[model samples]
Target: SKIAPQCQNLREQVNQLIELLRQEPTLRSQQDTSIVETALGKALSPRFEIVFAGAFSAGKSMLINALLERELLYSAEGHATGTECHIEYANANEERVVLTFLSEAEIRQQALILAKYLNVNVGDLNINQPEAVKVVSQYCQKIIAEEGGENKSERAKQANALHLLLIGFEQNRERINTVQNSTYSMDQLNFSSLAEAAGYARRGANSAVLKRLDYFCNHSLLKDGNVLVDLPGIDAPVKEDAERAYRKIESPDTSAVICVLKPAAAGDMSAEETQLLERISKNHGIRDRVFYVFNRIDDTWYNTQLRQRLEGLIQSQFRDNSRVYKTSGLLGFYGSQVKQTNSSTRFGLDSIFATTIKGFDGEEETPQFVSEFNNYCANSGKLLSTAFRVSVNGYETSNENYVRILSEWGIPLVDQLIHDSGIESFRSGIGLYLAEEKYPELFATLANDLQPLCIALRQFYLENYRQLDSQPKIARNSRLQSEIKQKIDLYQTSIVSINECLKAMQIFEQLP
Candidate 1:
């Protein structure tokens, strides 16, 4: 019954040992500082918040199971199983993790959020389930009373009564809080409304209890620091809901983002993944911190085709050495429940665990095996490191650009070949020359030369903006001004070259 004093005593001992570790001379020698015990961002507890995003049924849960080597989660298969942005923290069986969301409910039943948050159909979720498409709809309606419209404060009361929880579906205290607010509901109809609901859903959406239970445990050390936010692979830019969520996570100026991708037919990042990547490449936050994880290589449907496609994609977007790695995570997605996991039982290097989690705070998971594990560990470290060292070899151009240019490549040349025959002419005519049969050769030549340049120029522009933004406006100097002028002039020349081609094609004139 007298547990307060005992808890205090344990805290004191932990503090003493921690202080001693920092002061230990042997440990100090290993690090750069005598007072600090570890490297930068290395205070121990698992601190990386990884967001596993993919389309519905992209094996997102399986990928996570592989990484954690635990089969406790019932990641549903088919179009969608996860309902809400499920956040999971690895358990230590000793410590407890606490979660504090800002709100308690969502406002709309949008496609993107519903696909990932609920196992229901979109739009008509509040209505009766219609054949195969109304899956999410049926679930949504069941959770939130369909009869209760905006006027039903009673329903709101019920919704808040069942808010999120980390353990059992205890009292919906937070749900009550959200419902009391009444403004919070999942009915995002526009940018403004979606942003509001997004802000609300993150805190206490109806799925909170389940998300917290499935995601957090006693072992979790940091919030979003180690847990991965697994999203529907293809369900982004959902009108506005998904974009809002992405902006919060991909806050490059304030946060970090690590993107997973598979390049093989069976393993390659799906069409949905490509769309997500295209958006991330332009997102300032995502652009700066996107790490590519190629999973499912073992199930390579078209090895050469996938490899070539991925290599080309990476080459175009990545300026730094390609951090692409071929990995098979089939085993990590274990289904059986086990008591203890050992080195012999755990897979090596590509062990999904390493890439998914790091040392929590100051505690490391040292398996009861070594040497061979070390080898696997070392390789895994490099693979992970490559992911974080994401490079942008190209521009922030939209996928529309990719589509437009490709379309032009297939169209009839339109006689531009007479005047626009040079590298510039051929290069400039892509959007206009999208006829695949007629402009194949021109497309190849122009794409070969300009595509790389386009990517490089985009990166250059980004760096220039960043450098200028980060430049200390402490004081203006003549030399700095002149240097800026020169850089600006060069940029102008590039602009002119690009503009000349556009002008010749009368693109601007056609624009409103």
Candidate 2:
């Protein structure tokens, strides 16, 4: 509890951020780069926490596959016959078992399973007498690597993406059947609706499920500079899996998200970067965990000007920098193949299209590499810097258009959605948005529906601005977050040592 206050500080800061966002009227006009840039620290992360995220098959896996030299994970739900690992990073000592539990011998064993059964079974569950749990485990331990993975559908492509479920022993005391409130199956959780699922997740109550998952993420994105999670591009995935994916994306423990991009992915964010940013933001969730990755920029081909224009749209509109990234998954994967002795796999089309999406397959870093990476970072930083600047400057402009827009589109939309979602109890919470927008019509509508219940939520502040400041921030939220995180880190170190000592005394019994 002593350390939890740090998280409280973060919550306070987020509320402040909400108020800051409230100050803004609309998003149709040109934003002030200076105000936004200066506020970049407060508006979003000043440093790069790029996440390569996209719907399934968007090279999310391929990007990581190229980044991490070892392709130890795979994708595909059922028929693929293999599990792909979602990688992230964290303090190595943090409790986790996914990768830590797997020895090279164990990995080799799984590869053999994929080879003998999935490759040979040719049917979903052997298509007959499905009671082969023993065979699955027995075979899971035998397979190691895929020899022929030139095809995207090949077993090799998956090795870099999905997570293998290490026996959940220490996580659940290795007692899969413990049957406690703290344990629940991902499969079982899927059966519940979003409302039910979320209601079941009362914070601080039986948090072991989250604890184990957090441990799994410590290695990939947390340990490394960044990592990507490729969700299925199909708009709707298994609701439970999709919910789990987003929940993972929004995890407070994650440094930032690597959003995957394509022009038509959807909204302003259809591109992986924008798509990721907007989605992460939409959960009314964490403000910083989302970042962008421009995929197949190499394939955008022959139109350098258009590429720059698209980047400008991202910067001017999103005000998020370093959040935007570009890459070529096609080239990365092909190069990897070449290095693996598949010279014939290197095709002209592939070379022309490997953007930041799939990363570098087996390619060597060239002299141009430094310059390119630096430019990407520079552009990214500018985007974040500018978005914030524009927003601050937006305060002085003709907010009249904004007021109208808010009532007409923003406020009513949100209020209606909230009520429709069966969360009418929060109808008063709608006032927060109406207060910021100051759209009389929207507020009026809200009054009609929830006036009797309205609890002066709109009056919590005088200016409808963020609680942190009705004015500008001297430093960005990212900087403040960093500052506070340091305090948490200090407390954590002390607590960890104490725990270690306690464990030693109890488990070893050798202390004199």
Candidate 3:
């Protein structure tokens, strides 16, 4: 929850303004304090939501996981779902997961849509009832029969997801009913780890009934109250899911967007992604906030033609080529793993083998690439071996040279690897944008919004001053004269405060 010092100053100034307005009886009575109060509330705890949107299987989850430096999100092939995962900052040692479920009415409405698709008529069947469950089960089975063939279509996947949701609803109907429309923490449900909790919220039967998942952790990227929203893929199998994702992208709270893409797909961007870009382009002042990330760069680094095509597409749509980035989240994750192990090993490689290597003894569950990288690192000779060629920012180098530049199997190596992975550049770009663009823009907008209120208040005070000053000398006693003087003073003070706030913001905006 560490915001920029400039933001803190603005909040303090706004708070003072609110106090001043509230203290003046005339202003309080004449103007609505609620408007100022609402603005003040936003100033107190500002949330900069950076929404990550992309096509299905575009490595969105992996990239996010890499950014978080943990495997919090479930990232696997063909793992499709329509859940919005929001990761926000939390106090140290205060990690928590909140799962929000769909309301009964919502579930029933969705079920009705599914029923129509399946050509079944069970009118007025309560979704929570056994008969409704039986009918839904039958519907699910029929859909499976029709769509769940060798080549699993998007419709089949959607139906399977819906079927799982209904099954989860039937099993946990009572628990869900009690928690519907409310949030419940993962710990409250006896979940062991964040990864486990995320899996349940994403792929488990519970995923079907859940609306969204909010994860509060102490990730550095989430500092300053930044919320990283991993929206459902734009090409989601479910139409409602796709629509919801689009709505989230268009939400005013979204400060920036990272449009994730696969290099191969970027060559021939999906119609859905192209349409999304068009929609975003329609919004004034939104183009600059969009960043294109071509993930899984390791898969297509040598394909110069594909890269050119992707760049052409970006140029044709955004007219800016500097916003594009190429990254390999998997390598970034591996680098993180190495960094974690090395940091934990106090006595160097020997101690690492004694402690960290033992942790990885059970390779059965470990990812093949992760295992290979770890093994490569553990053997000093392999670190010097030129076994792989890597392209870093368009420059090709042997693995040994790359590893050396990354450092000597130490923290430096891991850092270099992360840098080479392109994740570091992407992360630094976000930071630069926040400081150089996002914060200034937010303050400017805030100042602009408050100007009208201040003008109205000033006009009110000035009009009162004129009315009081126009009173005849005989009718206007010492008290009336004093009241008239007070109105003039209030009008001047309002102008001074407004000017001061605006000036301070102007100075902040000019800061390098």
Candidate 4:
């Protein structure tokens, strides 16, 4: 189906304005004309960005890389993974760029906010004062620069909020970028290495190379301007870091947030977690975009129980909004590989084809297939074997049975949140969002952008035309004459067309 007729109509109007502008040789001479045109195209061509948000080391990077089915983003085992935001999107350009920056105003704002937590005022906070310097520098030495030496002074470890921010500012203030000649590599570009290269991982290593970081890799997902921003982990050791993460989540560029949590830590929501979800609930399509994903759901006895408790607790909180997805990113990644291999080895098995009904009496199966199938039953309480009638065979099995089999086999392609196998479920939901939320909104924003420009230009053009007619007779036909006349016509015609687009957008915004 086409976009809202109004939006489509608006796009056409904008395109016409662009064409007219292109033909106006003198248009280039107009200041800010390029700004209007560039921004105009962008309004309709905005990227649908989905940013993954969670505490540090919660497996966000891994989950995203698995979803993308590419190892372009990095992942690491410890806090060394650092707080740099890693964004991966697809583009044919096939290159990588790192963006780093530190705004003193931003740091100052967050620092003051944090200081209030510790009964201090930002105005009186002086980093150079002996008491303040001791507290702040020791913190940098104790926490940020944990070199495992005498640096661990108890006094340093007890640094106040104000000084800590000061340390972060002095060391963290600088240009941020990747190591020279860096590019994507599953091995070289992983989070651990990138963290070190960007200077976020090592302690007190604020060499000009390490301070500010926003890593971008040109993968094809951004081919149509779709972005997947990997936001830094929250509750950072440095208070400012946590604030920065929160700000990113609040940015307009963030279309959605995939909140990842470890099963062990998910039984009860933290104040931060609850607040985060609450914030998400206020966004458009609240339920759909504010995703709650409990990761690491491998059936380790402890993990299984944790998943159950998490589901129940969420049910109590999220209510109509409570649709928690229990997923295992590790399994999701491995499962994808296994699925590919299984498909190649045995394409039409009962697992793949809903129509497949290979009669089974236990002995008719290939030994390898039987072995793999048996392993799932043995491991997952034979949910598949029990749900399907003992005497049933293949696709003749019940709906519940298919889910059991597919989920255990890590091939779940189900739709609903309750029965989603793992990452596959999340993947499908993403598809649904793009088809519904993103596509429609993309057109709508384009229409919105065209509205003001059309109105403003219309006014400018009309007045110019009136002035042209009032010009002295000689001036009207002068060699450089009609100059004012030509511009008036340009604005007059463009504004009328632009209004049509605005009208379309207004109509679209009103549609159910």
C-alpha TM-scores of all predictions: 0.36, 0.33, 0.70, 0.52
Residue-level lDDT for 428 in candidate 4: 67
Looking at model 2, residue 443 earns an lDDT score of: 19
lDDT ranking, high to low: 3, 4, 1, 2
Candidate closer to the true structure by lDDT (higher is better), 1 or 3 = 3
User: lDDT scores for all predictions?
Assistant: 0.37, 0.36, 0.63, 0.50
What is the per-residue lDDT of model 1 for residues 89-147, given as tens digits with 9 covering 90 to 100? 43444222233332334332223343444333344322222242234334434566663
Q: Which of the two candidates, 1 or 2, achieves a greater TM-score against the reference?
A: 1
Q: 1 or 4, which is superior by lDDT? A: 4
Clashes by residue pair, model 3: 406-413
Position 249, candidate 3: lDDT: 84
Which candidate tops TM-score? 3
Local lDDT at 147 for model 1: 36
Clash pairs for candidate 4: 74-191, 90-219, 90-220, 90-221, 90-222, 91-219, 91-220
Give Cα distance to truth, residue 316, candidate 2, Å.
4.1
For model 3, the local distance difference test gives 0.63
Ranking by TM-score: 3, 4, 1, 2
Model 2 residue 180 distance off true place after TM-score fit, in angstroms:
7.9
Off by over 4 Å in 3: 1-45, 147-161, 178-180, 188-206, 263-265, 311-322, 342-416, 435-437, 448-495, 502-512
Native-to-model Cα distance after best TM-score fit, residue 431 in candidate 3, in Å: 2.9
